[PDB]
């Protein structure tokens, strides 16, 4: 078990034997572009590295096998990364998003630990045996901060230093080592930022840093070298290898570097998701992003109410809490030209339209269970009947309101007609109605019809691309891009009141979150909201978000109130379409290619 | 990513002086060094001088050593090249170049400024 050095340079993570020389070759990796930060798990014999050109964090065994991209979403510049080898967690710092995030070595249960008051955090060093994490911030007045490995107890450890890199922990002597890139020095301190000593003051430009036994190894971008020296006096310097320009990270791969123990290593602290280390040598259970910790301090609960705004290449989730949690990009693959989204709160599964692939797809929030429900046919918008478990959606090609089941089997075409172009759709199954836009040439309109295409009337005629609906407020909302404004009305058609119409360029989406009206401006790249109770007024939620496509609010499904709808219990006995009448009973109906039968429930052909 | 904007420079008599400026915008916290290059109408790119982003280290080529003085502003994100004892051999287009700790060798370039020395 011979100790050796490992360093990243361009697209090569390479190995340099310390004692004598052997295996001075690169680690056989396939798709590396710009390797940066490095760490390892010595018992699993695996290496972990980041990539800026790819915006990824990958892991692979020492022989290049089992190369997998652990983190591949929501990364901008992961210049720092470290491995919790006891709790088996992966920490990293991003200077583009300015946040320190944690997950597992597998990659699941990604959580943001620090996100406030961060100014470009880069170097990262962990100490799970004591429950502390240390990092360096390169922003205005750079500094070195310490926090508990769950994000709490964050203080400033070194305030006077310059831009620090190569933060390395000597666990035996209990000391910190780092390099000052502005004064071009190598310094050390104790675990509290005190007893500060200057290890080396005459080096050209030390950059990366690591420590092993009584020796300190550093890189030099001026001399383009890897050197080592006595960690105490700073002398007995030898050049390990030269002609190495722009070596990003460097470290010693040896078991003695990863010792210690906490409860997370023994039993994962009996936590459901994350086990994070805290002082002193203790632990607390952590949850995925947007998840909350239950009363047992062990299990995590997914968020029940939230927002979902999707752009051309991503689908994101917003959460409103007092701590102002950051938005999360849902790790769903094969997202090309997204145009609409919806969500089923019963099975808790997300649905969306993909225009490029030209299909409607569903998947869980973590990305699992990818299922294609319909696949020429150009779907435009969609809306879910969560009671009949149906999806109503318009087609841009056939110009038709078509309805399909969640399992993919079509119930049939509900609306069709010449000189008709139905685009946006929203369903109100509590009242058995559906509202949609009809963009006829030189004649737009907003129409309502029953969930079977009958009782088709015209609601809004003159003065005019997305509809929102709220039954609690009894209000219908829409937004026009030509006139560039947003309007509201009642479900019956009365009180057509114009909302805030100024400072709007190109509205695309609308939803109702509690007593608020969220809408997205695509060209202005904004997510805003209007207070529905008329108290706080117009407010900007987020600015400069490109390629926006849709937004969808999600309230928690009260299953007690859900089971009360007669359309939900075996579809009210109706094959196909169940309709709710004024009195509250049900009445069956069917698409245009079928006809109701004697039992007033089933349907079929005719002759 | 970093964007550089060169400014200053023009028609200057022989034996005079002229101060060049280079404004860095973007991820300037990640800047390692800033180097000045120049392109003559005949010769190709020539390396002139470099300075670390903290101003602690500096390097001048022997072609301009003793005359030119590369520096960084005391606050702003700009670097200056003070050119003294100008010769007709210095007539060229001067380029600012940034090398960052992130992305490493990837050089972010500016558009450069034209400098002419008449005699
Ligand atoms: C509303 O949405 C539903 C989707 O849920 C959609 O139903 C689909 O209709 C298409 C046809 O329009 C079906 O595709 C057919 O499948 C049958 C087997 O079931 C095939 O025999 C058919 O073969 C034809 O096409 C061939 C070319 O590939 C020809 O060579 C051949 O001669 C046949 O003409 C055809 O492939 C599809 O199976 C259904 N899907 C479901 C789930 O039922 C419906 O059409 C939509 N309504 C409108 C108006 O668009
Ligand atoms: C060379 O590459 C091979 C890739 O197959 C490496 O083999 C792998 O070694 C790891 C070592 O931890 C094995 O992980 C273990 O898996 C078992 C389940 O089989 C699990 O119970 C343990 O806790 C541990 O995680 C992994 O299974 C194994 N894969 C195989 C054999 O297919 C090998 O380690 C590499 N060689 C070196 C020197 O790194
Ligand atoms: C690391 O470097 C140091 C010096 O750079 C090496 O120390 C060398 O060893 C000799 C013999 O022990 C030292 O002699 C000293 O003499 C002074 C009086 O002059 C005395 O007070 C000391 O107690 C000591 O005996 C000396 O420090 C130095 N030799 C010379 C010629 O300077 C050390 O050996 C190096 N470490 C390794 C592992 O090589
Ligand atoms: C699950 O973990 C939470 C912490 O996140 C535990 O809450 C803790 O509850 C106790 C009381 O049950 C708190 O003790 C308090 O001490 C202060 C003095 O500091 C006193 O003024 C209070 O009246 C109270 O006695 C304790 O502070 C609190 N923890 C934190 C961090 O605030 C909870 O008890 C855990 N669940 C179980 C079942 O133990
Ligand atoms: C490093 O320097 C200290 C200073 O006294 C000395 O005691 C120690 O033996 C040196 N170790 C090596 C490996 O040179
Ligand atoms: Ca909608």
Residue numbers in the entry:
A (entry chain A): 630 to 1004, 1013 to 1101, 1105 to 1247
B (entry chain B): 2 to 120
Pull text from the paper.
A key mediator of β-catenin-dependent Wnt signaling is the type I single-pass co-receptor LRP618,19. The extracellular region of LRP6 comprises four YWTD-β-propeller-EGF domain modules (P1E1, P2E2, P3E3 and P4E4) and an LDLR-repeat domain preceding its transmembrane helix.
L-P2-B10 and L-P2-D07 share the same epitope on LRP6P3, burying a total surface are of 1655 Å2 and 1605 Å2, respectively. Even though the two VHHs share the same epitope on LRP6, the paratopes of both VHHs are different. The CDR3 of L-P2-B10 is six residues longer than that of L-P2-D07, which explains a difference in binding orientation of the two VHHs. The longer CDR3 loop of L-P2-B10 folds back over the VHH framework region, whereas the CDR3 loop of L-P2-D07 is directed towards the barrel. By contrast, L-P2-D07 employs a much shorter CDR3 loop that, together with the CDR1 and −2 loops, interacts with the same relatively flat epitope.
